[PDB]
């Protein structure tokens, strides 16, 4: 009986696409896939892949059934810091004590049920964690209000609606709300979360119950930030993928993994399922030898060879040359297909705009859909990509020609601004897509308020053409 | 050495060798050489083999290089090898009574070009046809044939009229047709060969030799001796040999299809401008600088596809050839002096094509007036310049630094070239988001924004029709 039956998918994951497990999908189009990610912290991608593979290999080899331990978490973090200069500074492998860890949270990484769960965390009140509106200051956040100071728990539901509304008022992608983590008993809290996980997992019978326990605890580990940095990589890109692979599910390819603080466990199950679905889509697209185009990104032969030359992960090679003969791929595939089915009947057009490429399937999806349905903007709680976006915004960010063509035919309002004040045009300019932009402009110029639509300003007071004029520009002090 | 210029053929980077045959005008829109190869599979490999095999032949023979019909016939056989499109019309064999006709647009013509053309006695004598008309079931349907009862005294004014008429139809549109000679092509081919060999020994200077070279390559093109492959044979192959005999590099053309209706003097400039392209490709490659000429940036995929496609044993022989008893500095100094003529003609336009340094650009545009910055080059200049502003050219070339400077000097971005295209139309066609966004910001900061965006070219297309058409395949495909 295998320990991590899901390792099948880690091997099935194409070598030249392996970086997708660590690099947020949100970066792909704008940062040459993984290039922007590796450049901020050279070495990280090799370190993160080695961490995931070496530890997966540790648990698959042991006779004991997999149980969470702080030593394991500590090893994961040490492994994520190897060769990384940016992470050597804050000592990897060792825990935080009284060192402060603070960060800002925008509306786009939050939900009302998320904020309710967050304020309801007794270890946040007990540990003296801070949360509320303010500004970034000289020595950390300058809080106007701290919601954990004299928090009446009865008030939590209405306060969560107010905190969310306040966060939106500032801007979906703007940071007004700050979080200062616990500076006492982090070692006790890390052990208590570990204890809770190990105890609760044996309680869950269904796969969907196990997923809620898994995310519920990964969230508590993220919210408690036990290390100075590499908290995300350690818990969501590493730790999380092991119990997923223990259930025989693939690892998670995230668009925006930075939602484990202010999203609810139920909403995180969906976020994780969507991310498991991206691994399935990459693997299937690679099997059928179809160029992978997820999240509007088309890799170049130059990007692929550079990554292949940069790849150095001995434990990943061990997994790639590993035997899976006494493992049924069909049953494994059928289990994840059934697990993922929940994602099917939810925002059909939006998911269509992200995943659907066949014009016949697209034409059928958009048949008998009304004006409110085709112009629908998903509300708070759905995975971050959907929030405030129309099928048209999503079709533009995905490079979905066939969906955009169909939406134009169904007469979708291309002037609708998302929660960042951006139109389909703003995104076309940012992505650098000439065809999508030309297609929208033809529509815009065939209407009366053309000049008004072209001059629509987003949250940053920028026009689609400010973004177009800024497209491709380097991040270097260079003459040419 | 027989061909000192072979030095540059070797100095030409292997993965860029296709640039000698593929018109620069195609590069941006057709993935460099990809569109060219796909029209006649095998053709670039043949063209290269023809040029190298015959250059290697003349260098190896102790006799001084002299043009012969056998050589020309050999070039043509070589250009058709493994090429199915060229096998149909028998390579190496000369035309007799088989018709050869094509249309000529204003953009490939000049007044001095048309004057020289009508003045060609072998065109009148051989019964060649030229004038306005339409394409018909069995060839062009002529409304007028200028070679029928041509009074030579009328030629200068007729050339102005033919040109004006050609413009009236549209710069890139074909209204004027040419039906070549169908009698004594073999005599004319020999007479042109005889004339060349005799005239070349008469020219003392390099500039005199260049006029004799083009004058004859033009007559060979105008007489179309073969049914097919006349361009490759004469301008991409034949022409490069006497250039390499003078110690000059071979010619990298933007538009080589100007050897019918351009004058010999105007063709010297076209050829010099093409020789200068080879010099820029080589120098950029030497400095490990990515080559960006004519708005095209090759992808690693395009380079490796061409590297896997390349097969020319004579080219390899040239690449592994010795040039120790050849002074590269003297060779380089001779071409620099030869190309110096090109320096003070349309400074801003050339700047827009070649210049990339912002300091050089800023200096070039200093003390330049409104008429100078918005200047559209008239008929006679190499085809790329005709009717274009420095701004059109900056956009076609992907020259960000020049476009940035032109916007600062307040260049009119609404000016239409002779095809009815604005700087915006070209930005949409090239697919450049940054250039387009930059122009749109300027357009939207003016009153007639909506008018400028709705400017229709000759094809009745808007800049945005081209943007919407950008990247679209040439295949019956759903996805
Ligand atoms: C941002 N948080 C605080 C909400 C969660 C992450 O906690 P952290 O900052 O302690 O850790 P981390 O470095 O693992 O963060 C992971 C996230 O940082 C970003 N990241 C990480 C590494 C890197 N080379 N470049 C990046 O941009 C990505 O958005 C990634 O998803
Ligand atoms: C077109 N003319 C008649 C004005 C010039 C001579 O043309 P031709 O048909 O005798 O011969 P040719 O095939 O050698 O012409 C060369 C020109 O044809 C075009 N060409 C040729 C081969 C190819 N695979 N693709 C092309 O686009 C290019 O414009 C090239 O520069």
PDB file of C-alpha atoms and ligand atoms in Angstrom, chain A residues 22 24 26-27 37-38 40-41 44 103 109 222 228-233 257-258 261, ligand 1:
ATOM      1  CA  UNK A  22       5.622  27.449  -6.978  1.00  0.00           C
ATOM      2  CA  UNK A  24       1.673  32.072  -8.892  1.00  0.00           C
ATOM      3  CA  UNK A  26      -1.089  35.645 -11.609  1.00  0.00           C
ATOM      4  CA  UNK A  27       2.596  36.321 -12.591  1.00  0.00           C
ATOM      5  CA  UNK A  37       9.943  34.800  -9.543  1.00  0.00           C
ATOM      6  CA  UNK A  38      13.520  33.253  -9.669  1.00  0.00           C
ATOM      7  CA  UNK A  40      13.590  38.144  -6.876  1.00  0.00           C
ATOM      8  CA  UNK A  41      15.227  35.354  -4.883  1.00  0.00           C
ATOM      9  CA  UNK A  44      14.370  29.559  -4.673  1.00  0.00           C
ATOM     10  CA  UNK A 103       2.101  42.238   6.178  1.00  0.00           C
ATOM     11  CA  UNK A 109      -7.249  38.255  -0.736  1.00  0.00           C
ATOM     12  CA  UNK A 222      -0.155  30.500   7.609  1.00  0.00           C
ATOM     13  CA  UNK A 228      10.295  35.043   9.651  1.00  0.00           C
ATOM     14  CA  UNK A 229       9.684  34.415   5.890  1.00  0.00           C
ATOM     15  CA  UNK A 230       9.139  31.437   3.460  1.00  0.00           C
ATOM     16  CA  UNK A 231       5.867  30.819   5.322  1.00  0.00           C
ATOM     17  CA  UNK A 232       3.914  30.498   2.068  1.00  0.00           C
ATOM     18  CA  UNK A 233       6.299  28.124   0.331  1.00  0.00           C
ATOM     19  CA  UNK A 257      -1.983  31.137  -3.251  1.00  0.00           C
ATOM     20  CA  UNK A 258      -1.793  34.212  -0.928  1.00  0.00           C
ATOM     21  CA  UNK A 261      -4.996  34.291   5.821  1.00  0.00           C
TER      22      UNK A 261
HETATM   23  C1  LIG C   1       2.371  37.058   1.419  1.00  0.00           C
HETATM   24  N1  LIG C   1       1.793  36.388   2.630  1.00  0.00           N
HETATM   25  C2  LIG C   1       2.492  36.909   3.845  1.00  0.00           C
HETATM   26  C3  LIG C   1       0.346  36.745   2.728  1.00  0.00           C
HETATM   27  C4  LIG C   1       1.901  34.877   2.559  1.00  0.00           C
HETATM   28  C5  LIG C   1       3.274  34.307   2.308  1.00  0.00           C
HETATM   29  O1  LIG C   1       4.129  34.307   3.481  1.00  0.00           O
HETATM   30  P1  LIG C   1       5.652  34.787   3.449  1.00  0.00           P
HETATM   31  O2  LIG C   1       5.744  36.126   2.827  1.00  0.00           O
HETATM   32  O3  LIG C   1       6.211  34.581   4.802  1.00  0.00           O
HETATM   33  O4  LIG C   1       6.319  33.760   2.423  1.00  0.00           O
HETATM   34  P2  LIG C   1       6.829  33.333   1.040  1.00  0.00           P
HETATM   35  O5  LIG C   1       8.134  33.864   0.590  1.00  0.00           O
HETATM   36  O6  LIG C   1       6.749  31.819   1.024  1.00  0.00           O
HETATM   37  O7  LIG C   1       5.638  33.832   0.091  1.00  0.00           O
HETATM   38  C6  LIG C   1       5.104  33.129  -1.042  1.00  0.00           C
HETATM   39  C7  LIG C   1       4.679  34.155  -2.062  1.00  0.00           C
HETATM   40  O8  LIG C   1       5.677  35.196  -2.169  1.00  0.00           O
HETATM   41  C8  LIG C   1       5.853  35.564  -3.527  1.00  0.00           C
HETATM   42  N2  LIG C   1       7.225  35.190  -3.964  1.00  0.00           N
HETATM   43  C9  LIG C   1       7.942  34.187  -3.332  1.00  0.00           C
HETATM   44  C10 LIG C   1       9.195  33.880  -3.711  1.00  0.00           C
HETATM   45  C11 LIG C   1       9.765  34.630  -4.785  1.00  0.00           C
HETATM   46  N3  LIG C   1      10.996  34.356  -5.219  1.00  0.00           N
HETATM   47  N4  LIG C   1       9.074  35.602  -5.405  1.00  0.00           N
HETATM   48  C12 LIG C   1       7.795  35.896  -5.034  1.00  0.00           C
HETATM   49  O9  LIG C   1       7.106  36.719  -5.648  1.00  0.00           O
HETATM   50  C13 LIG C   1       4.743  34.873  -4.320  1.00  0.00           C
HETATM   51  O10 LIG C   1       3.599  35.718  -4.363  1.00  0.00           O
HETATM   52  C14 LIG C   1       4.507  33.621  -3.478  1.00  0.00           C
HETATM   53  O11 LIG C   1       3.207  33.065  -3.641  1.00  0.00           O
END
